[model samples]
Target: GSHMSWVQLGSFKAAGTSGLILKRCSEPERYCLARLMADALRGCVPAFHGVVERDGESYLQLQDLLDGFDGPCVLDCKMGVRTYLEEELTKARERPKLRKDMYKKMLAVDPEAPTEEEHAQRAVTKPRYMQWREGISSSTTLGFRIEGIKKADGSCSTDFKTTRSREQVLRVFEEFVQGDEEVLRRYLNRLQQIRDTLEVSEFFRRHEVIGSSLLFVHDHCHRAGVWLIDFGKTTPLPDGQILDHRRPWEEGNREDGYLLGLDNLIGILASLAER
Candidate 1:
């Protein structure tokens, strides 16, 4: 099992060859949310077929965006200003989960991060580790981060854990499409459409979307597309509490920066497509 939230499932009965993905069932809220999106956000999202049970576990069946591609070039960008839910920070502060693995990861990046007490304990709280991770990556400054990139040749890289600069992100995009203007233009258009639709979507307006990502996929067929993916950490805000997704984050303000990230992404694509 990998850390990826979803996995491809081979032909099972009549599901034959159409392509499908199985993501482990997330929060109970996602069940209703997925159905709502399937009914309303059909064009911008993968088809939410239904659910499947295996080995006493439940999974949501979803459309495969990579279906029919001989070799798909895929890029996963985690959207939003913050990846973790505010509730996560609250729980961490309340319980303080000291993670040794996180401490080791921090030390790997910066030896000075772990103080005398931390070095002796060999651990740090989840919030501390998560905040440090956001600082190191583009999430803090750029409002989003590149999770990974997979080229059509089957090679992949997730080494962008520290990639933060706008110039660097633009470079990655250039490599991803390999100078294909049409593909780049298509992505730009699709993202623009997504932004337009999100502004009017009832579901989006009511939810604090966190840890979601925009998945970019294409192939030699030139069939480029982008879709919203991942809603595991997404949740609804209280009555009358609307999130201004474009605003900078502040303590107690539930801004996830989904629009801010999309705006930055669109600006980058627009620049690249100009030539």
Candidate 2:
């Protein structure tokens, strides 16, 4: 049995934390994405279908809420997530078809058919495009939007919307460094076994494109298990731009950069573990 219920979740600086009011999404695309996310999560974490009815009301068939609740809820800075994502992306690079498609779509050129304009463009400066393909698959390709906010002191800040977090990232990293050394050793051994069985690389190579996007998301929101409510104009990276590590808290930069490297990760984890 399912019905609509509106309960206050909490208040935040952004929306003045109100109740956890569930609203029905009339758009089919949004509904499809939600369902797709739920399905994708099932492979890594436990998740199930949240039925969005024909009338627009959605229902979450909650499993044991307590069983799924693991603590030290923290936000990961984008850099950390990018590091891990890059590893996975390396594995993806091994795939020929995926890589070819990516290059074809990303670059407005086709090896099969070259137009006069394309030939001229290629002739001017033979740009050696890197053939990148990773084995890891994405549930969806998301676009990001930046919103401008004016501070009390008449300063302005920007916000980026994305869905990645630092808290529960790098399962292998945590296992190796923090937990039982023997367990860590076993985990690495098992990873090798899986890799050998699948005939993939021992580790994944990270893609700069996806890695930067993930970092952008983590930089803005330090929390996980939440959705990006705002769907604004997602900015596209210019040619040759990699990680834009601009501090978001700084006057105009607002929501661009994230805490970088392992030192920051340890510090953040220590603070969270203490609580």
Candidate 3:
């Protein structure tokens, strides 16, 4: 059931990712998931409850506080700090155990990794399975949840990411390569490190098989963080196949459904830093 009217959160254009954040006023499913997550994280951090209605809109309110790196002091600071924030927020919010359990369940009944056609015949609906279908249909999109923060001086800002269009993604990619070479390099290096540490192929295969999104969140402030949101395009691998796309450097074009290259990635990083 719906409780509060939804509100439109502004949008942002980042390096390779563009996203829109919205205030979901009366979505019980989201609240239920949050509650389940909160239960699991009972002792780890503050639990998330459903949205609160005020002025006719439901708010998934966050505790207003500053926790992570402050806004970027310069171009370089923006890149470095935003990267750090992404990693930190990821670690803090990731529920590895829960993810693992979900993965196990997905693998149990459908080891064959049913095709879209086969999935249509299944009697019971599975969350991850549904997410897989949605993800494939929205290949170039992502979403995030917003956390509003209040400054000591009583000023307020909302932190969120928006979906990127194919064109915007290309622009961000070009700018990063020509304008922020060092930042671009650093980001590539870090991604390489992640690839090595996690065995990129294995990781991708695992997620694709389970039909889960590769979620990453960034904390704009210590207490205010935004979810990386929807992973509508991240489908489970078919029959244990790992999905791999070219790294920004290796890609020659943004066409053919491939969007968000290095330049765009850096541009968005810078934009968020400026915010």
Candidate 4:
């Protein structure tokens, strides 16, 4: 079994054998941002650092990050993503065992390369969960709670309705946009900006980097903006999966996956707007 860990040093936090921890986020996180803030497509998270040599084994150096253990290490190092949301979201939960094997192979550069039935078995048993707080999480944590919007027979609907009263939608939407038409204009402009950016990003058409979060930039600041998050492989645990029968992993390319993602994200947001 194996697992990996890193202490921070700002910018690229490189410690020992493990590669530097770039201040990025896990996938789905950035994809949320990608939907609105197209410029975020720059350096996708969970990015792979080229593997080093050791016999015949092909081990991924940054294969998976596991368990956040914060609060000052040996050399005044803080464990986990200290404060940056972009980098913090990049953190993931795999098994510590995967890391053990990674280091073990790196020792003599094991030619046989481990990753036997037992290694995957160990990974299969691991459980994943969220352990983020304001200090370590991103500023704009947002999402729309939704799942059903389409019917069978490959048919769908762009229209929506809310159970809440008109007064209800009015109260909340106004509260969200802060009762100012100018604020609403800015929000709509930003949303359109994100749409245009997504269309512009042709290189990542197939990456399916999807993330969602609510831009709660107000409440404390003058106003709030609906922002976004990470875009890469979300979980490393053998059990952690997106499990979409609509578009099986084998049936679609990254672009197809993202097209589906865009539909879902846009539909959900439009519904929210409708409400």
**Candidate number of the best TM-score:** 1
Deviating ranges (above 4 Å) for candidate 2: 1-54, 57-67, 70-241, 246-255, 260-266, 271-275
Whole-structure CA lDDT of model 2: 0.27
TM-score of each: 0.90, 0.23, 0.27, 0.31
lDDT string for model 2 (165-229, tens) is: 34333332352134434433433343234223222211111112122211111111121221112
Candidate RMSDs in Å, in order, are: 3.6, 17.1, 16.5, 18.0
RMSD of model 2, in Å? 17.1
Cα deviation at 93, candidate 3, in Å, is 39
Best by lDDT: 1
* lDDT tens digits by residue: candidate 1, 1-275: 11121222132222322576666766743564465664445688877777777668766777777775657789999998788878778887778778999999999999998889889989987767877877888788888888998765457888887788888888888888988888888898899889998887777877888888899988777779999888777787787678768998887888889998999999988987875
Clashes of 2: 28
Task: Go through the candidates in order and give each one's C-alpha lDDT.
Answer: 0.78, 0.27, 0.30, 0.31
lDDT of 4 by residue, 1-275 (tens): 01223221121222245433333333443333334234344332234454433344333333222212221111010111111222323342322323343334233333233346434443211111112221112111111221112211223332211212333333444444444455455455555665555455543432333333223222222232433333333221122233221242231221123333334334433555554
Give the Å error, residue 130, model 2: 40
